[PDB]
Design a protein around this ligand. Structure first.
Ligand SMILES: Nc1ncnc2c1ncn2[C@@H]1O[C@H](COP(=O)(O)OP(=O)(O)O)[C@@H](O)[C@H]1O
Ligand SMILES: Nc1ncnc2c1ncn2[C@@H]1O[C@H](COP(=O)(O)OP(=O)(O)O)[C@@H](O)[C@H]1O
Ligand SMILES: Nc1ncnc2c1ncn2[C@@H]1O[C@H](COP(=O)(O)OP(=O)(O)O)[C@@H](O)[C@H]1O
Ligand SMILES: [Mg+2]
Ligand SMILES: [Mg+2]
Ligand SMILES: [Mg+2]
Lengths: 312, 48, 312, 312, 313, 309, 312
DNA sequence: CTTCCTCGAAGGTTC
DNA sequence: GAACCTTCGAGGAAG
């Protein structure tokens, strides 16, 4: 299936796999539950996938829920009561839980107990619920929103990293086998270079090319069909969209490469101020096409040659 | 007089009185021959 | 009914139809649903009609709702439970949906399951609902209005654009052929030129012209009849509406031609910013009446001469 | 009754009156129901009266309700279910009803059918219902604040406009004859000018002037009597009411003409800031007495001369 | 004349008092009831007392109730049925009435009768209730929240205003006759000036000055005793409290007039944000001493000249 | 006992104490009940204490409740029905009463009657002459129609060093601890002007004197105890000193933003703004500016730094 | 046990530990309950641990609850009603109590009584509930969130401070004896210097090193194993994480040390403004590697000599 | 009904 | 005077 099930299949993230393997094997020798682990990083790098791999490698059933599903403290208490010794609890989008509920985990994670109010409302008393040994797994796109006392309780932190071309190429080939399609090694590398280092984007591109190759082709993906499908998709050989090309062109044509202020550029490109800064600009800076300067952003030589203009 | 007796309760309920209290209020009127207008007027006039 | 039912009837949008034809035909060879498609662009271009065409081409039912109509997660779950295998769900103004609801779609779109808290009090428990295969079709004005986690899950993007005079003319002739009416090419072209490039506007104008020609004329639409009918309505000789007239009149007579802030303008014309941003400004800009600058909007000489003011 | 009953009797609104007559008689020639009509403009211009006329001209029963008067979908469903073929439904303040109610209206207007959700909790189904032929007539006060997808469903728009002096004088004369009062054409002209272009206001002042003429005068509304009565009522020769005079006077005497923020101004005069911005500023702005500025409201030179204060 | 009976005795409100007289006389000239009246103005100006005076001038009885006291249509209909021809119904805080009742009042005010519909719609009948001619007098502090259909039914608008020094001075002199104290006309003027234009505030000051005069003096309010009484109570000649002076002095002395944020200003005087924004700031704006700006509060030139500080633009 | 019982024992509050003495004597002279009194101001200045003194001076039994204890109109009506002629009702934390309850209090304070719907029917109850006393730290939260009905308003102000010195000596006699006059002044300087803070310091100094000394507070033991508590001769805590030191040494006196300052000292933003900063501004050590907060010349002199304009 | 039980075992916190000894000893001589104590400060410094120590030293039973559990006055009233003479009540996360509930503690802490409504209907009466001598202990990280009247009632305040290398070394050795681990003193100091001054972090590192030492080593922690284990975790000799090093390196190489804005720097490292500002920037500033100035972040000379660059 | 937070303004520095 | 960066203040909407 699409989602890798074991570390033998999970390509990439060598730094994270090398650590998780040691901690899992150490926990098994001691016959203990794994320490609480937090997975965080950019979108689509494989955080949710790794959560299922950790459960399969431990050889235990996984209980699953999500941050937005826990609306009140009463819901979380009901979930915790269902735990069995050695159970793994996975909370996706953990940063979405309200603070009033997040503070209930503090005691459960460190001392395996919870204070609760029980009674008829007219008469009641506090009681301690005792929890069995369990492991909490959390995944979040922005750990900064979690309170400092919560993050401090996670004993294992896994920061996901972007994939390189050699690793991302194998992901494309593996996915093609699931689709029973044949992909030439040159075509697999072409799709990888345009996937912006993200597996979800590589799978999305592959699916669109696969549909094209079997409707107007002999059902085979080669270095010739890829160019035609990628032309229809309008994804440059560097992964730039038409909007990205419009930006780089505008700076060179109307401003001679800058420096130009974002407000000025935004007007010529007809795009909303923050949309440029938060959606399109981040990738262009990381790839080296744009350089932020004290007087404004400047288009580097890499942008000139890629767009075909003459640099000075 | 079933028309006036029932019409009074029907209209009195439409004015927001609970069906139970509306039925009692109309039933409390001594004169059965009281017309729909008189029953509703007397019921409201007697409740304030 | 007027609404086209198949790609053979849908005029224009060549770049969109050509892509949908390939993906739909491929998705039919394999017994599976079409990938979630996102349609975006100016309002009234026919994106809602496209949702009906896809359903008829796929041979499945189409369920319709809107972003602002769904207020809480319980409302969305009720809709998703009602879907049948392969059904199409269309959500208008998806960008306007509450964040508490949007985060529920993430799991539904990627793995077809939802985690929900069911019951009450002592009966509260977590259930892992498994959804059948379905296709989501979303509509929005601009792609930058959606969050990165949501936009990453839509596998097909359809950018729609304004129709050209040749296409609108054929649409007017088609519409006028459904009704028992007769229109000469000059009138059809004149009526199209006045339709601000939007099919929805063209149909409404044709309906009113038909009523006029039956009472004030011989029941046949001719250039002279269309000119008088369009003159009786508030449509100017080049599609400017009374609201457009008010904007230019206020800009020149009070602000002296600008620059003026869109917010300060909106509150003076007594119109919501969303209407000017999404309805009036786009046409006035693309037709050269309004120029966008870092300082604000400025009226052009074309607008000055149209209204008849002294352009110094 | 005071309000007119037919187009031959309805004074003014020549543009709207001429437009509706054509479309109304055109529909009769085809023997079909009239298209959905939207009325908008300042309050008290006769929008409701026009609805009664349209129904009488069509010869259809008029059913009236209001947006705020509808609280739940079951209310609107019961109303619509009691409509006979050809009935006209008039709904005032259609722009203020709850968003959950508009969902039913979209389908009713687009296809004369509705879909009602049934069940609760684990049960979630719906029932489809079709509506007989009918015509919807909407009335609004801020067309710029109506829901865009709803506004696009209306096929006919009626822009009500302020009455001119030749028309208001006829209304005052008409009303004076119903009261059997004696008024000269010169006195009626003064009342019309100071009536702020609104028929409802003209009636309010005419009633009050009658009480004054019956005591301070011989029951005849002379110009000398009319002027003495209007000064007693505190109505400026330009129609500015007691509150309007207080606003302009405060700006000039306490803030030297501004700029002054709405909050400060609304606290100096004992009035709710929302009331000042929603009910009083619109007239002062249209007359050009107050100009909204980034730093606050400012009193124009016109206000200085009108109030009798020397401009800077 | 503390509780007047006719306009002849009611102190102040000359504008509204003069207008109402003409409409009542014109109504009496005909066999008709006075048009529905709506009274506007800030709270505590005497609106309730005015309604009673109108009833006497018309020669009819007054039925008093309030919006919050009306919960269902039956309540209003029952109240109306108790009225006699020409009686006046006074409804305070008319803006707080429930919408479910508002829709019923329209028919009563316009037609003097109410028709109630009963049945399944497939079969239905109506009951007609005739009401005696009556006059409705509404009193509300907030007008914008009144629905347009309801406001359209009201035919007379009366605006209340703050009492001027001469009128407010007479209230003090006459109120001093309820008590056994003698107050000099000059002393009464000093209290009226500091009464912020409200009768209830003028009564409060007089009560406090009385206690001082009969304990620290000879039981007579002379100019000398009044000056001392208005000194123990730290009330400025403009009616500014001790805390009011501290606010202005702080803005001028430490911030040069501002702009200054509410948070910053609150911590300087050691007060809560809610207290400065609701207790002290409202009157300072009415006197024109400070203005509210996007950047914060600012002291006007009028405050500089009052506190005795140099001002420069 | 700690709480004084009469005006002869209540030290300070000259403005409020002098006014209340006049009003109480005048009311007694006429055999009338005292007007409704509202006491408000900063915490620990003596609001609750004064409410009991008023009752003892008038010679009346005091009924006592609190805003949080009253949750429905039925609660207030039951309490009001218990009043006897001349009774005084004291409601602490009056700002917590629900709006539905405040509306009932208007009629009782001004009209002396309550209308109760109780087979549904209305019963009209007549209340005898009574005095309501309210106390709160946030009088601005009360409804505007309620404040207008209070006839006496007492605004509490901070105490001066001579008064706090007398209070410290008084409390020391209750604890039967001997303290010298100059030793008592050292605590008064640090009490930040609040009687409750003065008592807290005395309790903590007593504990030290009993374990580390002969059980007597003198000019020598006080200096040791105050050094252990680490309270500056101006009442600044260890964190308060750290704030001023950081602003002068790292930013040259500012302007510096609250965020930057909080992170540098490793403190929560809320704590700096709401717990420590308020006293520094009122004493004049810090000033808020459009660009940030700056350390004044008074801060340089106290910390011992060469002032550089 | 992991948590120290007596002052003999509680390492560090000299200032707080010394004061509490004097106050506890003095309270015992008078045979009375200890004054109310508030413990606050950074996370993981030993706040909760100290609460249990106080109860053991006083020789009384501890009653425990938490702020998030007390949601209404009825909950608190039921807890206080169960207090016996000399009992200690500990409320963790006391800052979460609703403001309306804190106002009930005002009279309880100062006068040991609360006012409660009793009876039915018109017979209901308010009555004082009298409480025996008790001590309230509160622990919180957000002390500034408590109301001013509540904080003024606590008679003892304890502000927690970070630990020094000698104490952290002793803590690591102690924790090493709880497990069956042998650790060389040289290696124990190596972990202490990297624990950022927090005991919880020092314990977390030991657990991760132990797992490695028994999977890739002979089950003993020595300088050789410690170096290899810390290298895998990528923790610098100063405690800087991998991302922390990436930040300092980028500022020194691309911006020459700055000044640089947070937004600009966040994009270069592919992180987000909130994660950098909340997780990484705080420690870098407090330790002196980064300096905040009006112009932007600047790298100090300490960062240059640490990373190995010339401080030109 | 309340807290959180985000939107808008402006002071200061630099080229 | 265009362009960045830091900081404060008043809204307004999601609990
Ligand atoms: N290509 C087309 N051919 C024929 N009719 C069209 C076409 N595009 C749009 N229309 C018609 O114009 C209107 C478009 O409405 P709709 O599709 O709802 O626009 P939107 O979805 O943008 O609101 C419909 O009446 C539809 O039948
Ligand atoms: N053209 C007109 N001719 C005669 N009377 C009018 C006219 N316009 C308005 N009026 C009068 O003013 C009132 C209008 O009320 P209505 O139609 O409900 O206004 P709106 O619907 O704008 O509130 C009626 O009393 C009516 O008699
Ligand atoms: N014209 C007046 N003459 C004498 N006393 C007045 C007058 N207006 C107000 N007052 C005094 O101030 C109070 C406020 O006026 P009132 O009509 O009761 O308004 P409200 O009902 O809002 O309190 C009155 O009860 C009375 O004590
Ligand atoms: Mg995921
Ligand atoms: Mg108190
Ligand atoms: Mg803890």
């Amino acid at each position: 299936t699409l989602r890798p099930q074991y570390f033998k299949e999970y390509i990439g993230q060598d730094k994270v796999k090398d650590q998780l393997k040691i901690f899992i094997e150490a926990a098994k020798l001691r016959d203990e539950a794994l320490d609480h682990t937090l997975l965080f990083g950019p979108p689509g790098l494989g955080k949710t996938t790794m959560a299922f791999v950790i459960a399969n490698e431990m050889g235990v059933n996984l209980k699953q829920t999500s941050g937005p599903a826990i609306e009140k403290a009463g819901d979380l208490v009901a979930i915790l009561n269902d735990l069995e010794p050695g159970d793994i609890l996975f909370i996706d989008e953990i940063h979405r839980m309200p603070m009033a509920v997040e503070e209930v985990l503090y005691s459960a994670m460190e001392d395996y107990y919870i204070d609760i109010m029980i009674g008829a409302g007219e008469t009641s008393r506090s009681v301690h619920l005792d929890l069995p040994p369990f492991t909490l797994v959390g995944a979040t796109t922005r750990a900064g929103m979690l309170s400092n006392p919560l993050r401090a309780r996670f004993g294992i932190n896994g920061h996901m990293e972007y994939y390189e071309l050699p690793d991302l190429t194998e992901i494309v080939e593996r996915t093609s086998e699931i689709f029973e399609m044949t992909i030439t090694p040159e075509a697999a590398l072409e799709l990888a270079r345009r996937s912006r280092g993200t597996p979800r984007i590589a799978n999305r591109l592959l699916k669109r090319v696969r549909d094209y190759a079997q409707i107007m082709g002999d059902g085979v993906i080669d270095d010739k069909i890829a160019d035609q499908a990628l032309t229809m998709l309008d994804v440059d050989h560097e992964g730039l969209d038409y909007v990205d090309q419009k930006i780089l062109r505008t700076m060179i044509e109307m401003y001679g490469g800058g420096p130009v202020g974002l407000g000025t550029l935004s007007v010529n490109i007809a795009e909303e101020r923050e949309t440029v800064e938060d959606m399109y600009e981040p990738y262009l800076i990381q790839k080296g096409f744009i350089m932020r300067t004290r007087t404004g952003r400047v288009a580097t030589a890499k942008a000139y040659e890629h767009m075909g203009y003459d640099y000075t | 007089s079933e028309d006036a007796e029932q019409e009074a309760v029907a209209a009195l309920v439409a004015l927001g009185y609970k069906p139970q209290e509306a039925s009692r209020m109309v039933s409390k009127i001594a004169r059965p021959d009281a017309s729909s207008e008189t029953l509703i007027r007397d019921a409201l006039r007697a409740a304030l």
